[PDB]
Ligand binder design. Structure first.
Ligand SMILES: CCCN(CCC)c1ncnc2c1ncn2[C@@H]1O[C@@H]2COP(=O)(O)O[C@H]2[C@H]1O
Ligand SMILES: CCCN(CCC)c1ncnc2c1ncn2[C@@H]1O[C@@H]2COP(=O)(O)O[C@H]2[C@H]1O
Length: 264
């Protein structure tokens, strides 16, 4: 079809568009064809400190990917809204409205001047939601066999795959580095992950994660930095998700985790 949306861009815009998108979990499973359709529909939108890019309750129009600038996340608790987190010069938001045809479930506002790459909902539903149909096949059984995910309404566990993204790693490849700031949760799908620990300089092995085992969740809960490095042992495939997604769907897991986290 030629009813596709296309926003002509300069070589520079595409370059930046490219950097901004390299790590967006929602694009991880798209073939080159699907990705280029997406990129063509991306439009640039500048923002200013204080600007309410999204207001809770509003209608879902676009999906956003951050090019730069800081942001704050706000939710209303009984009528009072609080900063429940934030984004820092990278990440994506505004997908829930388009995926589930529901009102914006939060408020996003620039906490400094920024820029964004938006994606209309027609394109988003046409390609990303289609993409989720594929991901569900591939990982529905698997995800539904992960013990730590028993504590979730049958319905909640369904929306999990909708926001995970597949990351491939070669042998010897670093997945996360101890110390670094954390913005993602991992779940080994295939291969093996070696977890090691070091000391203040420039390495003791402390665990091995196999298909079905998660890691990188400690720093998300303790709101602390990476407490250990992770490396791929041979080809590894992890099903990942950002913290916002983590806290949004995994709250019902923090217990069985916080407890089993004592085993650290
Ligand atoms: C820190 C996680 C906070 N939680 C969970 C609390 C209920 C969130 N709960 C719901 N939506 C969130 C959350 N965080 C970011 N968004 C993003 O803010 C967006 C607002 O538009 P949306 O509902 O279409 O999609 C949303 C998400 O990408
Ligand atoms: C049973 C070994 C327990 N220990 C060693 C005790 C000091 C651990 N101590 C600290 N982190 C561990 C440990 N095991 C796995 N991780 C995982 O390795 C991850 C490193 O990133 P993270 O800190 O965000 O979350 C971590 C855990 O999922």
């Amino acid at each position: 079809a030629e009813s596709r949306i296309i926003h002509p861009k300069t070589d520079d815009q595409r370059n930046r568009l490219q950097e901004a998108c390299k790590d967006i979990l929602l694009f991880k499973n798209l073939d080159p064809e699907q990705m280029s359709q997406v990129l063509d529909a991306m439009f640039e939108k500048l923002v200013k400190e204080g600007e309410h890019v999204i207001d809770q309750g509003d209608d879902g129009d676009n999906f956003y990917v951050i090019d730069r600038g800081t942001f704050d996340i706000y939710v209303k608790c009984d009528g009072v809204g609080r900063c429940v987190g934030n984004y820092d010069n990278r990440g994506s938001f505004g997908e829930l409205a388009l995926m589930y045809n529901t009102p914006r479930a939060a408020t996003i506002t620039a906490t400094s001047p920024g820029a964004l790459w938006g994606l209309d909902r027609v394109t988003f539903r046409r390609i990303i939601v289609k993409n989720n149909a594929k991901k569900r096949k591939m990982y529905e059984s698997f995800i539904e066999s992960l013990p730590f995910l028993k504590s979730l309404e049958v319905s909640e566990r369904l929306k999990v795959v909708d926001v995970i993204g597949t990351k491939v790693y070669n042998d010897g490849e670093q997945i996360i580095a101890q110390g670094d700031s954390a913005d993602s949760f991992f779940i080994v799908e295939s291969g093996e992950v070696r977890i090691t620990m070091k000391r203040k300089g420039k390495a003791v092995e402390i665990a091995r994660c196999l298909r079905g085992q998660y890691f990188g969740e400690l720093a998300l809960v303790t709101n602390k930095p990476r407490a250990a490095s992770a490396h791929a042992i041979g080809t590894v495939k992890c099903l990942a998700m950002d913290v916002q997604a983590f806290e949004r769907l995994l709250g019902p897991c923090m217990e069985i985790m916080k407890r089993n986290i004592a085993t650290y």
